[PDB]
Write a protein that binds this ligand. Structure first.
Ligand code: MG
Ligand code: MG
Ligand code: MG
Ligand code: MG
Ligand code: MG
Ligand code: MG
Ligand code: MG
Ligand code: MG
Ligand code: MG
Ligand code: MG
Ligand code: MG
Ligand code: MG
Ligand code: MG
Ligand code: MG
Ligand code: MG
Ligand code: MG
Ligand code: MG
Lengths: 80, 115, 93, 96, 107
RNA sequence: AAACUCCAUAUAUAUAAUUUUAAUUAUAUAUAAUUUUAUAUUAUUUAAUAUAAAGAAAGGAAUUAAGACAAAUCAUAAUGAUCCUUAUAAUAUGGGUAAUAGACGUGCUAUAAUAAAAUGAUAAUAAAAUUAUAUAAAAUAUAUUUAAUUAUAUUUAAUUAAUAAUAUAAAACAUUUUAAUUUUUAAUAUAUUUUUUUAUUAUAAAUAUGAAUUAUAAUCUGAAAUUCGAUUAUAUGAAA
């Protein structure tokens, strides 16, 4: 849910256990909005191929998790 | 499991069966089954007046609903073949397949567009 | 290639005439996280500073004792703990 | 609009009371459009056809007297037999 | 045009066209893969007046105003009074036609 | 091939209690032309030009043969042979198909005054087609001090349709404005060009073109808009 009313996007996670004991949260959500309730929790967000380790700072609070796991590789040209 | 592809034992549609068709049909059946419930959950979610905790719970429930409850997941296949491109709704058929049927005279009132 | 500032002829400081570098310094009051004020001499012109993140509010230094802001503002009617408990099923991971 | 607003609002409320329709003067999101939408599920379900339709299996059930022949099935069986003969039959399936 | 010089504007325009329209044109040819031997060719009325009009338009476009209609009118008045590079161009065309006298085929 | 065919046209008849009306219509059935006749002028009884009198009489669509190109399609579908059968078959969660050096087609928008923008409610003038997996009218609210416009929200009036809605068609035409342009403005006078004139003073290569690119805020659909959707607002204003 983008629109301010109805928001924000929420997904079920193993949050409380992570908060108690530093066990990273392997998310395959990528469309869950980051919340104030998880800043300083270690997330392992899916990238299509491999799960990506991220520590959620206070600057990330508005954004989605998938925004920090870049799916495509950085393009180059083989100059032949 | 082993004995069936999907959780619920649904019937096969008559005539042309295909894996994709099978997948779609089952999905449609599940949508039909759980249409009212989904609507009710949506209503509970998108409510300024109701308690916020309840709306959150409803939203969570909606999120947790499977692939086969989703209306958006349904895709209109061809019924004669199993194609899913240029599928005309007025005769649930693919473009080429529709034309083939039309020229034969299978369609109830279709004919060459001469002007 | 190497970026430089090319030197002019150096000014001859005579023996005995060398003077110590007394830089211009103001007496600056630092109020820490709590109301404890401390005076320190400083080269920047600011008589008073108040600090937000110090040792006096850091957990390491006392064990015994605006994206987030924006989010809070525009999800205020909902009031977002109870919410955590509601949205934290730890089966799937 | 020289006619007053409050009176018009009252009239609208009265009309709403008379008919079943709701009266929302503030213009808040009530959620009415979610429920009020006609549910389309049965029509969607009925897309591919009537699953209970007569098949060749039944054409033996209804008319045992008539020894029918399903041609496509027979052809398939003949093909399978041919494959078996020339060493191109299906490999035996693993169970584990 | 009428306002500037009080006499039938359409008639004046027609006269201007008649004056300006070159009676023939030196049309180029391939000539059986050889020298491109040009020939004078007689012009239809429309073609004659078409040639004139394009020149008139060009000469109007050199005038000052924002509105093209004004520019056009000024140009038409000038032509009625008797001044244009269009006339010079016509004269040149006629001279070029005069060269190549017997290049005309049927004669 | 032509012709019969369909659309469109002209005429006639039938039907429509002229509130489902548009009879200036719609739709069944006919008739009508691949037009006819005559006077002349060239070339040999005819054939092209011209003239005349008789007619509503003038188009478009479908149809694209045989062969060929081992042209395209095993990804509409089906089938031969061949290969896979705990996998080359089947289901879920996410990602990809949207990657970006150069290059190639198709388009769209532009580079301003024979051309762009504001406005136009006794609402200037159409056709064709869609609306029970819907079309959504009026009206209220916010963006926005009036209101209209445009965009959302609020809520469903009417109709599953010659009856209601999508939907007051738009260019047109008319007033206004328009930088480049000291080809204008505003201070004075001026006057039989007064939405204006004259005099004297001051007014000193991308805009009041274009809309790429980006920042923030909202809205829409959906369970979900990060990769990867669509609007609106306030800024941004490349190239050309
Ligand atoms: Mg779909
Ligand atoms: Mg009528
Ligand atoms: Mg034919
Ligand atoms: Mg052929
Ligand atoms: Mg071939
Ligand atoms: Mg080939
Ligand atoms: Mg095959
Ligand atoms: Mg293939
Ligand atoms: Mg197939
Ligand atoms: Mg597989
Ligand atoms: Mg593509
Ligand atoms: Mg322009
Ligand atoms: Mg109008
Ligand atoms: Mg309306
Ligand atoms: Mg209507
Ligand atoms: Mg602009
Ligand atoms: Mg430039």
């Amino acid at each position: 849910s983008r629109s301010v009313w109805k928001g924000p996007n929420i997904v079920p996670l193993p949050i409380r256990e992570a908060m108690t004991k530093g066990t990273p949260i392997r998310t395959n959500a990528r469309a869950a909005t980051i919340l104030p309730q998880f800043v300083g929790l270690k997330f392992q967000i899916h990238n299509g191929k491999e799960y990506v380790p991220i520590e959620i700072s206070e600057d990330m609070v508005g954004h989605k998790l998938g925004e920090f796991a870049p799916t495509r590789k950085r393009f180059s040209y083989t100059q032949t | 499991m082993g004995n069936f592809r999907f959780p619920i034992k649904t019937k096969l549609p008559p005539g042309f069966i295909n894996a994709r068709i099978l997948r779609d049909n089952f999905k449609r059946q599940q949508f039909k089954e759980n249409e009212i419930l989904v609507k009710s959950l949506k209503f509970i979610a998108r409510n300024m007046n109701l308690p916020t905790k309840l709306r959150l719970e409803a939203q969570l429930k909606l999120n947790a609903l499977p692939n086969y409850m989703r209306s958006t997941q349904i895709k209109n296949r061809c019924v004669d073949s199993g194609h899913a491109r240029f599928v005309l709704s007025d005769f649930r058929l693919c473009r080429y397949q529709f034309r083939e049927n039309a020229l034969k005279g299978n369609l109830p009132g279709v004919k060459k567009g001469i002007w | 290639t190497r970026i430089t500032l090319p030197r002019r002829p150096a000014k001859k400081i005579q023996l005995g005439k060398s003077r110590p570098a007394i830089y211009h310094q103001f007496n600056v009051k630092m109020e820490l996280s709590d109301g404890s004020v401390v005076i320190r001499r400083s080269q920047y012109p600011k008589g008073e500073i108040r600090l937000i993140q110090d040792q006096r509010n850091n957990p390491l230094w006392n064990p015994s004792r605006g994206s987030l802001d924006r989010f809070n503002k525009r999800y205020s009617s909902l009031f977002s703990t109870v919410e955590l408990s509601e949205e934290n099923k730890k089966k799937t991971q | 609009m020289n006619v007053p607003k409050a009176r018009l609002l009252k009239v609208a409320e009265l009309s709403a009371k008379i008919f079943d329709q709701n009266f929302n003067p503030s213009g808040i999101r009530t959620g009415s459009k979610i429920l009020n939408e006609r549910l389309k599920g049965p029509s969607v379900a009925s897309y591919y056809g009537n699953p209970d339709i007569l098949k060749f299996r039944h054409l033996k059930t209804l008319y045992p007297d008539i020894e029918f022949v399903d041609l496509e099935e027979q052809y398939r069986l003949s093909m399978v037999e041919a494959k078996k003969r020339r060493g191109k039959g299906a490999p035996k399936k693993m169970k584990k | 045009v009428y306002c500037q010089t009080r006499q039938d504007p359409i008639q004046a325009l027609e006269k201007s066209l008649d004056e300006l329209a070159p009676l023939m044109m030196t049309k180029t040819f391939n000539t059986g893969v050889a020298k491109a031997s040009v020939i004078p060719v007689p012009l239809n009325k429309r073609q004659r007046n078409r040639i004139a009009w394009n020149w008139i338009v060009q000469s109007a476009n050199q005038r000052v105003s924002s509105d093209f209609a004004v520019r056009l009118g000024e140009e038409l008045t000038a032509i009625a009074k008797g001044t244009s590079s269009a006339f010079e161009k016509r004269d040149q065309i006629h001279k070029t036609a005069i060269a190549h006298r017997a290049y005309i085929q049927l004669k």
